Amino acid sequence: HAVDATIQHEKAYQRQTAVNENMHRPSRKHVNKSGHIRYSKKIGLGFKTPAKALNGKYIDRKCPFTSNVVIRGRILRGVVHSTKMHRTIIIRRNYLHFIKKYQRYQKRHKSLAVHCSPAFDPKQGDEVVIGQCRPLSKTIRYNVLEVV
Amino acid sequence: GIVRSRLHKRKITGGKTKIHRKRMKAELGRLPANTRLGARRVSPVRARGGNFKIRALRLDTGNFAWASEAIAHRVRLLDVVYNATSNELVRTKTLVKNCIVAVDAAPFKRWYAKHYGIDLKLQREWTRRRRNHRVEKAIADQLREGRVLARITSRPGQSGRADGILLEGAELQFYLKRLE
Amino acid sequence: AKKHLKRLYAPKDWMLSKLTGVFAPRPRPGPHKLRECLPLLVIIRNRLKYALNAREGEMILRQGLVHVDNHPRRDGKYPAGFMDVVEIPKTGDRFRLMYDVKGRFALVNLSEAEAQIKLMKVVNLYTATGRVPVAVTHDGHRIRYPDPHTSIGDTIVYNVKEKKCVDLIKNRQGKAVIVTGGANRGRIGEIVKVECHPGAFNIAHLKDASGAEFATRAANIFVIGKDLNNLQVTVPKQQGLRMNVIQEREERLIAAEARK
Amino acid sequence: ENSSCVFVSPIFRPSTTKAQVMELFAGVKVQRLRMYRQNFAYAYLDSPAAAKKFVEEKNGTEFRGHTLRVALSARSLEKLRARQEAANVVIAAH
Amino acid sequence: SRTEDVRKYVVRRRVVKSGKKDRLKAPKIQRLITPRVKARRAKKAKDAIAKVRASAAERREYLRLIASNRRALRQRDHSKKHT
RNA sequence: UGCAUGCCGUCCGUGAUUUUUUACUGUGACUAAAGAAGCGUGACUAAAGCAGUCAUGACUUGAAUUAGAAAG
RNA sequence: GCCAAGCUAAUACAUGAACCAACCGGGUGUCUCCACUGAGACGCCCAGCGAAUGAAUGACAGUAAAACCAAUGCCUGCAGUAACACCCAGCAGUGUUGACUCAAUUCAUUCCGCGAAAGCCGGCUU
């Protein structure tokens, strides 16, 4: 094959670790619909692999569907707050907290940094489902699993 | 000594962490190997649990694989040509994982002749082997020139070895243009 | 690197008094967990009264007079646990360690025939070098060639004299189990259904012989027979039936009046 | 137990022609050769009765290239003919 | 010589104490190979090969069981089609 | 070692098709002792303790039970 | 707190075990045979646990009737049909999890850590 200029925008060549793309007799186990070889996996907790993961061309280590990152621990929900960073977003969780002495509630919120794979295109104000993973940066502990 | 803890870092609020404990051995770091090209010289390091890490200081030979043929050979290293971190590493000829090197191509030529009967007993399994098999012009051009490009796949500062794989496909063209 | 155990921090089931010592014997690593075991010194000094103190317990144990699973044990900190067989041939005593209806450790007397086998729960299955399937047990045993139908929830009947497996009982909808942990420990029931929640704890719903309903986590049930009437092991006196607290107190008062 | 067919091993189909086997065979034998196991060879004598050619030689002697073994095949040629009649009907039936 | 006994040539030291019999002191000989020791070593090799032989037999029985259960399923299938 | 083989509603895996939470409330699970509540017990009573009671041993002795924020 | 010389133990340190003793695979040379390539010897290598790099396996689970070539299997043309050119005619066609680049297996090249303590007692020539 030739070099895809739409993808190779770095000083080092971008490739998937799991498979070898330069194979003369590729195996149908990891053969994509468009001929090429692509590695993808099924994560566990009743979630579906997006079609862009199986049939796309993006290279993303730290993607739960196309890399060695696994999902284990907590599953949470939140609303998208900011999308200014590259391949990572900020989400907000809003909740009510009870005070016993004054039998009443007060509004509180929390913020989390979440890695977003190129399979999704969330916008500010949208709702997402996220899952816990191993530490990926100084602050990132979650990965986007579905966009609603 | 060197530590790997997060205590000295700033908080995301910009505030300063007040440390109320001394440094612990369980969070240490060590000085880098800075492996160079030359006659073999290694140094053992006793790591946690009693196991040993082999710190390579100089290397000049390695085990390199031709992925298409699923074989491997032991060959001599000649030069360091490219490095994505910085070209000051190329100037000093430093060996690290994922750097591009040039290796001797003579052992690979000998294997090709003895396996396919092609120069670049009655039982002719060669005719069977050449059926539905072809070689890339980019590789054969280097095999005739004497040296062939390869990518280091091991971590010399952790295991003491410099192993790798030959460049083929679109990855070969990517680095050829970056060297042109 | 902890090697002590304060008496206030020791498990309540050991029944050690708070006023008669600062420390308790700390069990060593072994077949059973520290929080779910009963050290040999506690068995021989308390419970059975063959030893009056720790000095006499050491005399008995270090001679090799106590056998656990057909093997002499010489350590008073050896952790003994659920379904273990303890034999003292010089005295002529054989017991199995079980849970009574109140969740406490109980020693059940055994006949010579019944002392040759023990029930083993599978907890893991993996492949060893040379493609050998291995089954890991709740008491740390490693069986090198289990039956091809073995699953992680099943129970294995194991002959300890010949070191050979004899039978396999599967975890199904119509089987009898005993609870080994939680608030319902010691109760014997029958499986009604099992709820599967991937990634979290599965929940089992059980039915007692008297029709009472209760539930536990799937990791706390232990298969012991194909139905409530054909059990492959001997159970304690109460047969795993929880009794009403109001009713139980009334009978105890009546019995005291008649006894005197 | 006396049976018509007799089993011959370890003759090799690709190395020996058809003419070679009856050279060892006394006669009146129907030959069939198998390739799933090279050694296999079934010899159904016309009038075997007491298999003199099987009780004699067999394990004691050796065929060309390799030693040979013979055992009673416990197979009746009549049953094969019965299946042959049914099979031909099936071929006609389709 | 190689076959000569060495216990006879060990050096004895004489100790004299007043009003007591003489004391003769000789070392205990180390690395003295006796027929009791020779039999002990040879048993170790014999049981090591025995244990490995038993393990291979256990493997054959397991593979026999797997194959036998596998052939009964296809035999049962052929029985259904025949009837 | 074929020593073998036969005499409509469900179960389980995978694909296709489209959507309702949170909160409150009822149960249930999972949750160290010591401390608090309290069932039994004439340590001479009590503050205590978990023991002891009765005729080559028995009581197939006893040591019941509860509450503990919020979040999950 | 210390120096030099002379003696001497090991379960300290170092070295080191052929045949008994198997199954299975990869690469290659001389003999027999078939056909005009295929099979079997024979030789010759190399194949342990663990570690490193590379290549495969680590399943399937969206449609059905039939022709034509070359190579094969079984019947005397397509019935019958785990797989496999003999020694083994069933000596793995089947690891686990919610999920794995994990467990384990085969192939190529490379380490350059791995005693049967070369041990100690006891009971009856073993």
PDB file of N, CA and C (backbone and C1' of nucleotides) in Angstrom, chain C residues 7-9 12 15 17-19 102 104 181-184 203 215-217 220 237 245 248-249 252-253 259, chain F residues 28-35 39-41 49-54 58-65 72:
ATOM      1  N   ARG C   7      -5.810  -9.531  70.727  1.00  0.00           N
ATOM      2  CA  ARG C   7      -6.985 -10.333  71.048  1.00  0.00           C
ATOM      3  C   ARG C   7      -8.277  -9.634  70.635  1.00  0.00           C
ATOM      4  N   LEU C   8      -8.355  -8.314  70.819  1.00  0.00           N
ATOM      5  CA  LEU C   8      -9.551  -7.581  70.413  1.00  0.00           C
ATOM      6  C   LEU C   8      -9.746  -7.604  68.902  1.00  0.00           C
ATOM      7  N   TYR C   9      -8.669  -7.770  68.143  1.00  0.00           N
ATOM      8  CA  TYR C   9      -8.725  -7.818  66.690  1.00  0.00           C
ATOM      9  C   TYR C   9      -8.929  -9.225  66.140  1.00  0.00           C
ATOM     10  N   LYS C  12     -14.297 -13.169  66.099  1.00  0.00           N
ATOM     11  CA  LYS C  12     -15.213 -13.424  67.205  1.00  0.00           C
ATOM     12  C   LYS C  12     -15.514 -14.909  67.370  1.00  0.00           C
ATOM     13  N   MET C  15     -13.824 -17.319  70.095  1.00  0.00           N
ATOM     14  CA  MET C  15     -14.329 -17.310  71.468  1.00  0.00           C
ATOM     15  C   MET C  15     -13.186 -17.272  72.485  1.00  0.00           C
ATOM     16  N   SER C  17     -11.498 -14.906  75.498  1.00  0.00           N
ATOM     17  CA  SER C  17     -11.944 -13.875  76.426  1.00  0.00           C
ATOM     18  C   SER C  17     -11.028 -12.658  76.393  1.00  0.00           C
ATOM     19  N   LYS C  18     -11.631 -11.473  76.508  1.00  0.00           N
ATOM     20  CA  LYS C  18     -10.883 -10.225  76.423  1.00  0.00           C
ATOM     21  C   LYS C  18      -9.991  -9.981  77.634  1.00  0.00           C
ATOM     22  N   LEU C  19     -10.265 -10.621  78.767  1.00  0.00           N
ATOM     23  CA  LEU C  19      -9.553 -10.332  80.004  1.00  0.00           C
ATOM     24  C   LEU C  19      -8.403 -11.286  80.295  1.00  0.00           C
ATOM     25  N   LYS C 102     -26.194 -21.045  63.459  1.00  0.00           N
ATOM     26  CA  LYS C 102     -25.884 -19.702  63.927  1.00  0.00           C
ATOM     27  C   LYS C 102     -24.611 -19.140  63.311  1.00  0.00           C
ATOM     28  N   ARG C 104     -21.496 -20.356  63.569  1.00  0.00           N
ATOM     29  CA  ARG C 104     -20.278 -20.642  64.309  1.00  0.00           C
ATOM     30  C   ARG C 104     -19.640 -21.937  63.822  1.00  0.00           C
ATOM     31  N   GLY C 181     -20.726 -17.714  53.988  1.00  0.00           N
ATOM     32  CA  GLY C 181     -20.360 -16.366  54.382  1.00  0.00           C
ATOM     33  C   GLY C 181     -21.556 -15.445  54.415  1.00  0.00           C
ATOM     34  N   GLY C 182     -21.404 -14.353  55.150  1.00  0.00           N
ATOM     35  CA  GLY C 182     -22.454 -13.363  55.258  1.00  0.00           C
ATOM     36  C   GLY C 182     -23.358 -13.584  56.456  1.00  0.00           C
ATOM     37  N   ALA C 183     -24.531 -12.954  56.389  1.00  0.00           N
ATOM     38  CA  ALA C 183     -25.505 -13.037  57.470  1.00  0.00           C
ATOM     39  C   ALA C 183     -26.228 -14.374  57.522  1.00  0.00           C
ATOM     40  N   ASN C 184     -26.234 -15.132  56.428  1.00  0.00           N
ATOM     41  CA  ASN C 184     -26.949 -16.397  56.347  1.00  0.00           C
ATOM     42  C   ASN C 184     -26.026 -17.602  56.479  1.00  0.00           C
ATOM     43  N   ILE C 203     -26.208 -12.917  42.103  1.00  0.00           N
ATOM     44  CA  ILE C 203     -27.071 -13.081  43.266  1.00  0.00           C
ATOM     45  C   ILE C 203     -27.847 -14.379  43.121  1.00  0.00           C
ATOM     46  N   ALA C 215     -31.506 -14.873  50.250  1.00  0.00           N
ATOM     47  CA  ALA C 215     -30.582 -14.672  49.148  1.00  0.00           C
ATOM     48  C   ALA C 215     -29.193 -14.353  49.681  1.00  0.00           C
ATOM     49  N   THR C 216     -28.181 -14.689  48.884  1.00  0.00           N
ATOM     50  CA  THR C 216     -26.787 -14.391  49.182  1.00  0.00           C
ATOM     51  C   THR C 216     -26.072 -14.081  47.876  1.00  0.00           C
ATOM     52  N   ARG C 217     -24.786 -13.764  47.977  1.00  0.00           N
ATOM     53  CA  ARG C 217     -23.952 -13.625  46.796  1.00  0.00           C
ATOM     54  C   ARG C 217     -23.508 -14.996  46.309  1.00  0.00           C
ATOM     55  N   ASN C 220     -20.781 -17.230  47.960  1.00  0.00           N
ATOM     56  CA  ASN C 220     -20.975 -17.716  49.317  1.00  0.00           C
ATOM     57  C   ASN C 220     -21.756 -19.021  49.381  1.00  0.00           C
ATOM     58  N   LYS C 237     -26.485 -30.766  63.855  1.00  0.00           N
ATOM     59  CA  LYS C 237     -27.740 -31.281  64.400  1.00  0.00           C
ATOM     60  C   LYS C 237     -28.954 -30.525  63.872  1.00  0.00           C
ATOM     61  N   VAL C 245     -36.547 -16.353  66.820  1.00  0.00           N
ATOM     62  CA  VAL C 245     -35.899 -15.952  68.064  1.00  0.00           C
ATOM     63  C   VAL C 245     -36.890 -15.975  69.221  1.00  0.00           C
ATOM     64  N   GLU C 248     -37.515 -19.687  69.926  1.00  0.00           N
ATOM     65  CA  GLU C 248     -36.351 -20.366  70.486  1.00  0.00           C
ATOM     66  C   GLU C 248     -36.169 -20.037  71.962  1.00  0.00           C
ATOM     67  N   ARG C 249     -36.427 -18.787  72.349  1.00  0.00           N
ATOM     68  CA  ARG C 249     -36.306 -18.411  73.753  1.00  0.00           C
ATOM     69  C   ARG C 249     -37.358 -19.111  74.605  1.00  0.00           C
ATOM     70  N   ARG C 252     -36.391 -22.714  75.381  1.00  0.00           N
ATOM     71  CA  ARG C 252     -35.282 -22.789  76.327  1.00  0.00           C
ATOM     72  C   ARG C 252     -35.760 -22.565  77.755  1.00  0.00           C
ATOM     73  N   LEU C 253     -36.715 -21.655  77.945  1.00  0.00           N
ATOM     74  CA  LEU C 253     -37.268 -21.426  79.276  1.00  0.00           C
ATOM     75  C   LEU C 253     -38.025 -22.650  79.776  1.00  0.00           C
ATOM     76  N   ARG C 259     -36.093 -29.414  83.483  1.00  0.00           N
ATOM     77  CA  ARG C 259     -34.839 -30.040  83.890  1.00  0.00           C
ATOM     78  C   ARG C 259     -34.641 -29.953  85.398  1.00  0.00           C
TER      79      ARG C 259
ATOM     80  P     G F  28     -36.093  -7.480  54.785  1.00  0.00           P
ATOM     81  O5'   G F  28     -34.899  -8.029  53.891  1.00  0.00           O
ATOM     82  C5'   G F  28     -35.109  -9.143  53.039  1.00  0.00           C
ATOM     83  C4'   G F  28     -34.122  -9.190  51.900  1.00  0.00           C
ATOM     84  C3'   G F  28     -32.651  -9.092  52.256  1.00  0.00           C
ATOM     85  O3'   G F  28     -32.122 -10.287  52.802  1.00  0.00           O
ATOM     86  C1'   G F  28     -33.100  -7.764  50.357  1.00  0.00           C
ATOM     87  P     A F  29     -30.865 -10.230  53.801  1.00  0.00           P
ATOM     88  O5'   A F  29     -29.615 -10.000  52.842  1.00  0.00           O
ATOM     89  C5'   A F  29     -29.334 -10.909  51.791  1.00  0.00           C
ATOM     90  C4'   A F  29     -28.322 -10.360  50.818  1.00  0.00           C
ATOM     91  C3'   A F  29     -26.954 -10.026  51.383  1.00  0.00           C
ATOM     92  O3'   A F  29     -26.135 -11.175  51.512  1.00  0.00           O
ATOM     93  C1'   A F  29     -27.689  -8.281  49.952  1.00  0.00           C
ATOM     94  P     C F  30     -25.214 -11.384  52.809  1.00  0.00           P
ATOM     95  O5'   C F  30     -24.036 -10.335  52.617  1.00  0.00           O
ATOM     96  C5'   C F  30     -23.282 -10.292  51.416  1.00  0.00           C
ATOM     97  C4'   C F  30     -22.445  -9.044  51.343  1.00  0.00           C
ATOM     98  C3'   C F  30     -21.744  -8.649  52.629  1.00  0.00           C
ATOM     99  O3'   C F  30     -20.554  -9.389  52.833  1.00  0.00           O
ATOM    100  C1'   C F  30     -22.744  -6.741  51.635  1.00  0.00           C
ATOM    101  P     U F  31     -19.942  -9.551  54.305  1.00  0.00           P
ATOM    102  O5'   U F  31     -19.320  -8.120  54.603  1.00  0.00           O
ATOM    103  C5'   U F  31     -19.250  -7.635  55.930  1.00  0.00           C
ATOM    104  C4'   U F  31     -19.245  -6.131  55.983  1.00  0.00           C
ATOM    105  C3'   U F  31     -19.155  -5.539  57.376  1.00  0.00           C
ATOM    106  O3'   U F  31     -17.819  -5.449  57.833  1.00  0.00           O
ATOM    107  C1'   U F  31     -20.885  -4.466  56.163  1.00  0.00           C
ATOM    108  P     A F  32     -17.001  -6.767  58.252  1.00  0.00           P
ATOM    109  O5'   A F  32     -16.035  -6.243  59.397  1.00  0.00           O
ATOM    110  C5'   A F  32     -16.566  -5.843  60.647  1.00  0.00           C
ATOM    111  C4'   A F  32     -15.765  -6.433  61.771  1.00  0.00           C
ATOM    112  C3'   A F  32     -16.299  -6.193  63.170  1.00  0.00           C
ATOM    113  O3'   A F  32     -17.320  -7.117  63.507  1.00  0.00           O
ATOM    114  C1'   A F  32     -13.966  -5.774  63.103  1.00  0.00           C
ATOM    115  P     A F  33     -18.056  -7.055  64.934  1.00  0.00           P
ATOM    116  O5'   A F  33     -17.063  -7.824  65.917  1.00  0.00           O
ATOM    117  C5'   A F  33     -17.120  -7.607  67.317  1.00  0.00           C
ATOM    118  C4'   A F  33     -15.746  -7.593  67.936  1.00  0.00           C
ATOM    119  C3'   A F  33     -15.647  -6.932  69.296  1.00  0.00           C
ATOM    120  O3'   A F  33     -16.061  -7.776  70.350  1.00  0.00           O
ATOM    121  C1'   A F  33     -13.910  -6.136  67.922  1.00  0.00           C
ATOM    122  P     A F  34     -17.196  -7.286  71.367  1.00  0.00           P
ATOM    123  O5'   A F  34     -16.505  -6.103  72.175  1.00  0.00           O
ATOM    124  C5'   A F  34     -15.364  -6.343  72.983  1.00  0.00           C
ATOM    125  C4'   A F  34     -14.651  -5.064  73.335  1.00  0.00           C
ATOM    126  C3'   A F  34     -15.495  -3.968  73.962  1.00  0.00           C
ATOM    127  O3'   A F  34     -15.759  -4.166  75.341  1.00  0.00           O
ATOM    128  C1'   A F  34     -14.175  -3.036  72.255  1.00  0.00           C
ATOM    129  P     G F  35     -17.251  -3.997  75.919  1.00  0.00           P
ATOM    130  O5'   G F  35     -17.690  -2.529  75.484  1.00  0.00           O
ATOM    131  C5'   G F  35     -17.113  -1.382  76.092  1.00  0.00           C
ATOM    132  C4'   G F  35     -17.635  -0.100  75.491  1.00  0.00           C
ATOM    133  C3'   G F  35     -19.139   0.100  75.523  1.00  0.00           C
ATOM    134  O3'   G F  35     -19.621   0.527  76.783  1.00  0.00           O
ATOM    135  C1'   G F  35     -18.335   0.643  73.378  1.00  0.00           C
ATOM    136  P     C F  39     -34.311  -8.079  77.778  1.00  0.00           P
ATOM    137  O5'   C F  39     -33.840  -9.564  77.462  1.00  0.00           O
ATOM    138  C5'   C F  39     -34.544 -10.350  76.518  1.00  0.00           C
ATOM    139  C4'   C F  39     -33.950 -11.726  76.376  1.00  0.00           C
ATOM    140  C3'   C F  39     -33.542 -12.436  77.653  1.00  0.00           C
ATOM    141  O3'   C F  39     -34.637 -12.974  78.372  1.00  0.00           O
ATOM    142  C1'   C F  39     -31.877 -12.735  76.006  1.00  0.00           C
ATOM    143  P     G F  40     -34.576 -13.092  79.973  1.00  0.00           P
ATOM    144  O5'   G F  40     -33.469 -14.205  80.248  1.00  0.00           O
ATOM    145  C5'   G F  40     -33.667 -15.556  79.855  1.00  0.00           C
ATOM    146  C4'   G F  40     -32.455 -16.408  80.146  1.00  0.00           C
ATOM    147  C3'   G F  40     -31.940 -16.379  81.574  1.00  0.00           C
ATOM    148  O3'   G F  40     -32.672 -17.232  82.434  1.00  0.00           O
ATOM    149  C1'   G F  40     -30.125 -16.181  80.064  1.00  0.00           C
ATOM    150  P     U F  41     -32.752 -16.928  84.007  1.00  0.00           P
ATOM    151  O5'   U F  41     -31.266 -17.150  84.532  1.00  0.00           O
ATOM    152  C5'   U F  41     -30.653 -18.429  84.484  1.00  0.00           C
ATOM    153  C4'   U F  41     -29.184 -18.352  84.819  1.00  0.00           C
ATOM    154  C3'   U F  41     -28.834 -17.735  86.162  1.00  0.00           C
ATOM    155  O3'   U F  41     -28.972 -18.650  87.236  1.00  0.00           O
ATOM    156  C1'   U F  41     -27.410 -16.861  84.473  1.00  0.00           C
ATOM    157  P     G F  49     -17.454  -6.705  81.979  1.00  0.00           P
ATOM    158  O5'   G F  49     -17.263  -8.285  82.046  1.00  0.00           O
ATOM    159  C5'   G F  49     -16.057  -8.856  82.531  1.00  0.00           C
ATOM    160  C4'   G F  49     -16.216 -10.323  82.847  1.00  0.00           C
ATOM    161  C3'   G F  49     -16.717 -11.207  81.718  1.00  0.00           C
ATOM    162  O3'   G F  49     -15.686 -11.589  80.825  1.00  0.00           O
ATOM    163  C1'   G F  49     -17.895 -11.709  83.708  1.00  0.00           C
ATOM    164  P     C F  50     -16.000 -11.836  79.270  1.00  0.00           P
ATOM    165  O5'   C F  50     -16.720 -13.255  79.233  1.00  0.00           O
ATOM    166  C5'   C F  50     -16.129 -14.401  79.843  1.00  0.00           C
ATOM    167  C4'   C F  50     -17.129 -15.515  80.030  1.00  0.00           C
ATOM    168  C3'   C F  50     -17.597 -16.190  78.744  1.00  0.00           C
ATOM    169  O3'   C F  50     -17.870 -17.568  79.008  1.00  0.00           O
ATOM    170  C1'   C F  50     -19.455 -15.267  79.862  1.00  0.00           C
ATOM    171  P     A F  51     -16.704 -18.676  78.951  1.00  0.00           P
ATOM    172  O5'   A F  51     -16.980 -19.592  80.226  1.00  0.00           O
ATOM    173  C5'   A F  51     -16.517 -19.221  81.517  1.00  0.00           C
ATOM    174  C4'   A F  51     -17.639 -18.693  82.375  1.00  0.00           C
ATOM    175  C3'   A F  51     -18.149 -19.613  83.473  1.00  0.00           C
ATOM    176  O3'   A F  51     -17.353 -19.617  84.642  1.00  0.00           O
ATOM    177  C1'   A F  51     -19.978 -18.783  82.269  1.00  0.00           C
ATOM    178  P     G F  52     -17.026 -21.004  85.384  1.00  0.00           P
ATOM    179  O5'   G F  52     -18.426 -21.762  85.455  1.00  0.00           O
ATOM    180  C5'   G F  52     -19.349 -21.534  86.513  1.00  0.00           C
ATOM    181  C4'   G F  52     -20.768 -21.755  86.049  1.00  0.00           C
ATOM    182  C3'   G F  52     -21.497 -22.957  86.632  1.00  0.00           C
ATOM    183  O3'   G F  52     -22.067 -22.683  87.899  1.00  0.00           O
ATOM    184  C1'   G F  52     -21.789 -22.911  84.285  1.00  0.00           C
ATOM    185  P     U F  53     -22.358 -23.868  88.944  1.00  0.00           P
ATOM    186  O5'   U F  53     -23.560 -24.688  88.295  1.00  0.00           O
ATOM    187  C5'   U F  53     -24.884 -24.173  88.289  1.00  0.00           C
ATOM    188  C4'   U F  53     -25.854 -25.149  87.671  1.00  0.00           C
ATOM    189  C3'   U F  53     -25.941 -26.511  88.342  1.00  0.00           C
ATOM    190  O3'   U F  53     -26.808 -26.507  89.461  1.00  0.00           O
ATOM    191  C1'   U F  53     -25.720 -26.795  86.007  1.00  0.00           C
ATOM    192  P     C F  54     -26.529 -27.477  90.708  1.00  0.00           P
ATOM    193  O5'   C F  54     -27.001 -28.909  90.194  1.00  0.00           O
ATOM    194  C5'   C F  54     -28.323 -29.116  89.718  1.00  0.00           C
ATOM    195  C4'   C F  54     -28.464 -30.453  89.032  1.00  0.00           C
ATOM    196  C3'   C F  54     -27.950 -31.656  89.806  1.00  0.00           C
ATOM    197  O3'   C F  54     -28.886 -32.117  90.767  1.00  0.00           O
ATOM    198  C1'   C F  54     -27.171 -31.755  87.572  1.00  0.00           C
ATOM    199  P     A F  58     -20.571 -38.383  78.345  1.00  0.00           P
ATOM    200  O5'   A F  58     -22.110 -38.705  78.591  1.00  0.00           O
ATOM    201  C5'   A F  58     -23.121 -37.979  77.910  1.00  0.00           C
ATOM    202  C4'   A F  58     -24.206 -37.515  78.849  1.00  0.00           C
ATOM    203  C3'   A F  58     -24.850 -36.187  78.495  1.00  0.00           C
ATOM    204  O3'   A F  58     -25.848 -36.313  77.501  1.00  0.00           O
ATOM    205  C1'   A F  58     -24.321 -36.223  80.800  1.00  0.00           C
ATOM    206  P     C F  59     -25.897 -35.275  76.280  1.00  0.00           P
ATOM    207  O5'   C F  59     -26.480 -33.946  76.938  1.00  0.00           O
ATOM    208  C5'   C F  59     -27.738 -33.958  77.595  1.00  0.00           C
ATOM    209  C4'   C F  59     -27.969 -32.702  78.398  1.00  0.00           C
ATOM    210  C3'   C F  59     -27.782 -31.386  77.666  1.00  0.00           C
ATOM    211  O3'   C F  59     -28.901 -31.046  76.867  1.00  0.00           O
ATOM    212  C1'   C F  59     -26.762 -31.274  79.804  1.00  0.00           C
ATOM    213  P     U F  60     -28.729 -30.809  75.288  1.00  0.00           P
ATOM    214  O5'   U F  60     -27.636 -31.881  74.857  1.00  0.00           O
ATOM    215  C5'   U F  60     -26.857 -31.694  73.684  1.00  0.00           C
ATOM    216  C4'   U F  60     -26.070 -32.930  73.341  1.00  0.00           C
ATOM    217  C3'   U F  60     -25.050 -32.777  72.225  1.00  0.00           C
ATOM    218  O3'   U F  60     -23.835 -32.195  72.663  1.00  0.00           O
ATOM    219  C1'   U F  60     -26.329 -34.722  71.850  1.00  0.00           C
ATOM    220  P     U F  61     -23.459 -30.696  72.229  1.00  0.00           P
ATOM    221  O5'   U F  61     -24.192 -29.788  73.311  1.00  0.00           O
ATOM    222  C5'   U F  61     -23.798 -29.822  74.674  1.00  0.00           C
ATOM    223  C4'   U F  61     -24.707 -28.987  75.540  1.00  0.00           C
ATOM    224  C3'   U F  61     -24.777 -27.506  75.202  1.00  0.00           C
ATOM    225  O3'   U F  61     -25.679 -27.223  74.147  1.00  0.00           O
ATOM    226  C1'   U F  61     -24.432 -27.764  77.521  1.00  0.00           C
ATOM    227  P     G F  62     -25.312 -26.126  73.034  1.00  0.00           P
ATOM    228  O5'   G F  62     -25.414 -24.739  73.805  1.00  0.00           O
ATOM    229  C5'   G F  62     -26.652 -24.275  74.323  1.00  0.00           C
ATOM    230  C4'   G F  62     -26.460 -23.045  75.174  1.00  0.00           C
ATOM    231  C3'   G F  62     -25.822 -21.851  74.477  1.00  0.00           C
ATOM    232  O3'   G F  62     -26.778 -21.068  73.784  1.00  0.00           O
ATOM    233  C1'   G F  62     -24.746 -22.238  76.554  1.00  0.00           C
ATOM    234  P     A F  63     -26.398 -20.303  72.427  1.00  0.00           P
ATOM    235  O5'   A F  63     -25.372 -19.177  72.885  1.00  0.00           O
ATOM    236  C5'   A F  63     -25.765 -18.113  73.741  1.00  0.00           C
ATOM    237  C4'   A F  63     -24.564 -17.332  74.202  1.00  0.00           C
ATOM    238  C3'   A F  63     -23.683 -16.777  73.091  1.00  0.00           C
ATOM    239  O3'   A F  63     -24.139 -15.512  72.640  1.00  0.00           O
ATOM    240  C1'   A F  63     -22.344 -17.908  74.694  1.00  0.00           C
ATOM    241  P     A F  64     -24.237 -15.169  71.074  1.00  0.00           P
ATOM    242  O5'   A F  64     -25.784 -15.332  70.733  1.00  0.00           O
ATOM    243  C5'   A F  64     -26.338 -16.614  70.486  1.00  0.00           C
ATOM    244  C4'   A F  64     -27.841 -16.576  70.378  1.00  0.00           C
ATOM    245  C3'   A F  64     -28.430 -15.591  69.385  1.00  0.00           C
ATOM    246  O3'   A F  64     -28.370 -16.048  68.048  1.00  0.00           O
ATOM    247  C1'   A F  64     -29.637 -15.491  71.411  1.00  0.00           C
ATOM    248  P     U F  65     -27.997 -15.032  66.862  1.00  0.00           P
ATOM    249  O5'   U F  65     -28.863 -13.731  67.172  1.00  0.00           O
ATOM    250  C5'   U F  65     -30.203 -13.623  66.717  1.00  0.00           C
ATOM    251  C4'   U F  65     -30.899 -12.401  67.266  1.00  0.00           C
ATOM    252  C3'   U F  65     -30.504 -11.058  66.675  1.00  0.00           C
ATOM    253  O3'   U F  65     -31.081 -10.802  65.408  1.00  0.00           O
ATOM    254  C1'   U F  65     -30.645 -10.874  69.021  1.00  0.00           C
ATOM    255  P     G F  72     -24.925   6.617  45.543  1.00  0.00           P
ATOM    256  O5'   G F  72     -24.142   5.240  45.408  1.00  0.00           O
ATOM    257  C5'   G F  72     -22.809   5.207  44.925  1.00  0.00           C
ATOM    258  C4'   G F  72     -22.152   3.883  45.207  1.00  0.00           C
ATOM    259  C3'   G F  72     -22.953   2.649  44.841  1.00  0.00           C
ATOM    260  O3'   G F  72     -22.908   2.347  43.460  1.00  0.00           O
ATOM    261  C1'   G F  72     -22.043   2.376  46.996  1.00  0.00           C
TER     262        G F  72
END
